[model samples]
Target chain A: AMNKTLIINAHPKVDDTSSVSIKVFKHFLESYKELISNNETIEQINLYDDVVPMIDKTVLSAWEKQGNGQELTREEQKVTERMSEILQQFKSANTYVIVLPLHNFNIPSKLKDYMDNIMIARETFKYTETGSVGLLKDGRRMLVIQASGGIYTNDDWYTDVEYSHKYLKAMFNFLGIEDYQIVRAQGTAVLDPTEVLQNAYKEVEEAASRLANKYIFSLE
Target chain B: AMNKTLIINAHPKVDDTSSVSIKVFKHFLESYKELISNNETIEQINLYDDVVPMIDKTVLSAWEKQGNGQELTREEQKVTERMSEILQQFKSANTYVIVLPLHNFNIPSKLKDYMDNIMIARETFKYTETGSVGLLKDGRRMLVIQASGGIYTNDDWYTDVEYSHKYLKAMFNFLGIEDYQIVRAQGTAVLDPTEVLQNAYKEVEEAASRLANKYIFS
Candidate 1:
């Protein structure tokens, strides 16, 4: 079976002088070029172009109806339909890559809005008496590529990895998706970005190879 | 001399039955009834009614220009002008209250966009040699009301308070806004919601009195 993958490029800009994650992202993509013949094997969306609106009242109410499997108005149906499609993309994917630039010590609001769209009841997760249960099946994988002006890896003097990083793990863990990995190129504002990029590139290449070999190499 | 205050309701819904922060929010407002009717002394904006647009490229580029004092097209100026007005609202006000409904272990994107809009250079703060400095002079206050299902407060059970709570403090601290408080209602769906809301109300009332009395007394 061909592995399905979705790459959400959430860098917020086509390019930023101080960011090297995009360049590393290209390397990750290149490692998967062998899957080119498999047209539907890979999909990509640049969030900067496709700005996800926050859950407005119309969407929220429509979502309530949709979750209940009830009838919805034309406009209400439209937003639900849209969210359903995005949810399907994430649902069906064997691997997911989220490329982002750390902003304001947290996840950029754009990607956060995208997250808000898909994490709906009866979709990604459902509520229960004890707590909400993650309905997503296991065996799926995820990769996060992020660039930051300062390092967040350790308790060093220059680090503040709080929301943007932890939120990813929390949401994914809640959904029972435990195989995700992070490829972070930090200190983008450093005098030599090459060192950071080089190390991140190695990690991403190895991750891509492992993923590719697991699905693609075995298929042949 | 009256205190200028701006209250932003970051609750994404008109009302959610599971949430009690809004109810407490109303009570907090009523505590300041006397402060109203003073005209421009107190103001409010519901984020649900006003969904702030994400900082798109056009707005971002225009903002760069606006900061540099360079010329901008009418469209660019239009957006910049709008942002300037919002910055003014926060800058001029001595008190800021953000009523929030916690989503996904963090603030909803609504409040996030509001933050992005107002946290612009030359408007909220300016850059200095030793990193960016909070240009605004001292003497300001802020209040945050948060409600959520499940408990992130106590480390006993499953929890995460770093984002929804800490982010606000970190940002405000960086901006030099020292006087602020959070009135939180947690465990909304934790078996007995009545149990949860009762404790939250007590906290909010005191927070309201504390905030009101500070400015009111001074």
Candidate 2:
């Protein structure tokens, strides 16, 4: 029962057919296209298409109005402005659909960079007495379509720190997005004659429908 | 006994006082110098200083002998050359010591980018009829020094697919650096006084000496 769902698709190569994340994304795209006809908006940020900058000097020092107790330069101003622009995109979105492949048992490097980019101080969260709290407190829902090459899973691995999913949960939770509906399409490598891929696709389709239903009717 | 060790330190902000990874690096650096005798060499790649390029178009296409099945251009040749140079550094070294901070529950983007670039098929691994086999048959050791702001431990969570060290293992194992050893010096954000830092320094000291002794005598 949501209108605006922000889909952050984090993959190195978009059209890589061998990848489960890509297959799942295509399915979501079709569902979303049908969904668009119903007056729903899916703002997809294909991370590879628009690669983010590293957490370099420009980003870290941009906050200081003056550098070395002196006035800020024009370049520094631009850096801060560009960072703010990225944060604005996250702030505007209500619901989230994060589609990513678990590269080396964790989120893709670019995806991790994106999370750090958005989760900024004096922008997303302010310091609480104990620790901190998220400013995006509008009761948001997150639908995560995480695909993994190898099975670095939730059930098998350490239960406390879930592979890929747990980090997403921790990050979003830190930002005040509590409700997460996760779909892990893992074990994509060496799929035997499309059986594993097909099976994974089926699970995604089911999750997509449920997500679509709630999104389509949440306002009501 | 290993005489040469390659230490790849992946901390963008190495001089930053808040990070425990830097402290661990300093400890390792000192030990490598002191424990390293006249005939020893400690090669280091401080990532901040020699930062790896982002995984982008030029490098990706450069991997293909011909992007569109044509002759290689100057730029593409340069890209391939630079990548080869990095790979050479890895191939030349016998032992590896990777010191890194846990950023967003993983190694930094550039570090991951380096892994993809160096993990070449013809170079690192050759194809078999059934599966691929590692080319670097020599037994080597990888000592990982991973630090974090908070504690997201192996014991606490999915220990097998451990965030930072596991990535190292997977990458090296793919190329046959089987003897894996790791140390985690986490919870640096809330460390009070010098005690917390000092205690972790002692742990790193032990690991560094063990590595140094191997190089020192071997």
Candidate 3:
């Protein structure tokens, strides 16, 4: 089977040239393409364009009614089917690249909505006697590419409150993925971001090179 | 000026009897009504019904264009007007009660969208020589009422990963609200939640009573 990489882009500005995150994402993709082999496949889902489903009252009602052995209405079935399709596509990938800007102090709401639909019980995880257990395929890798206007690393005053990076790390861990990594460009608003962004770009290039090699060796 | 309370309800199962957070919210409202004076007013914004705007491409573009002193198109003007309205209403409230269920490990996306629209630079906080300082009025209090299926308190394995409670606390503090409180009903899925829920209900009752008196005193 060909190695598949899912790129979930969560930038609200979409293809706007003014967005630092989008610029970083463009560099990452170019670097990745230079190293990626024909044995690997790439699929990108831009959250700004993707019609991601939010867990609204209708969706929750469908789950409740279906669990109680009740039939779903046409609307309920449609919404639930969309959610299943999202989950299926998410589980089909062996690698994931989450690209986004740090909106406020956390991931964009669109990305959060996407995650809430995918991380379902009995699909990505199961409740065990001790605690919840992840049920994902082994050897999965995730890379988070983030851009922030402020620096929040190495015990800075705002480091503790920066939930964007921490939440994503915890979320990937909860799903049983161990090889989670992050490359970020910080202080873009308050300081000159040229050096920081250049460092992140280099890291992105190295990550793509390493991941592409892993894909080749995995099937050998 | 009369004290006003804003209740931002983020539960997807709105008014559904099965929603534990809604039930707790009802208890809180009732307790608050019993203690609240005519000097206090209450308003609720149910995210399931409210037309909360997401920070989409149009909205972001509008902001960018406006910041660059460019003219807004009709659509951009409409979207920016709605955002300004949302922010204005949010700023009007002296006290806020955020009622939500722990969707995954954090708050619901609907609520996050609302926050993104309201927590604007030069509105909620301002960047200064030292750091970003909150611009909210003094003595504003926030109370978070949450219901979760798992226990994530104290030294539990999931405690550090619990962003629902932690995020709200950090957000309130960042916005200059010092008197932040939380009442939660957890472990409904992995264990019996009756006793835990009862304790949270008692806490909610106390919070409502105390907040109502503070409104009167202030």
Best by TM-score: 3
Candidate 3 per-residue lDDT, tens place, B1-218, comes to 76889999898877774778888889889889888879888988888787888888888779889999999999999989988988888888889999899878988998888888778889998888777878885899898988887787756767887887788888878888889988877777866667866878888888987888743332
**For candidate 1, what is the TM-score?**
0.85
Residue-wise C-alpha lDDT for candidate 2, range B132-208, written one tens digit per residue: 56788797778888876555453653343244665566667768888777777766666563755676677767776
Candidate 1: chain B TM-score equals 0.85
lDDT of 1 at B8: 87
Chain B in candidate 2 has what TM-score? 0.85
Query: What are the DockQ scores of the candidates, in order?
Result: 0.48, 0.26, 0.81
Candidate 1 residue spans exceeding 4 A from truth: A14-19, A34-40, A51-53, A66-70, A154-158, A193-199, A214-220, B14-19, B34-40, B63-70, B122-133, B156-158, B191-198, B214-218
lDDT tens readout by residue for model 1, B1-218: 56787888887775564447887777677766644445437788777776365676778678678679889988787776776677777787888888888877777776777788777667677755544666665778888888777677676435554477778877877777989788777777664777777787777667766766644443
* Per-model i-RMS: 2.0, 3.7, 1.0
- What local lDDT does model 3 show for residue B195? 80
User: Cα lDDT for residue A211, model 1?
Assistant: 68
Alpha-carbon error at A128 in model 2, in Å?
Answer: 5.3
Better of 1 and 2 by lDDT: 1
- Native RMSD of candidate 1 (Å): 4.5
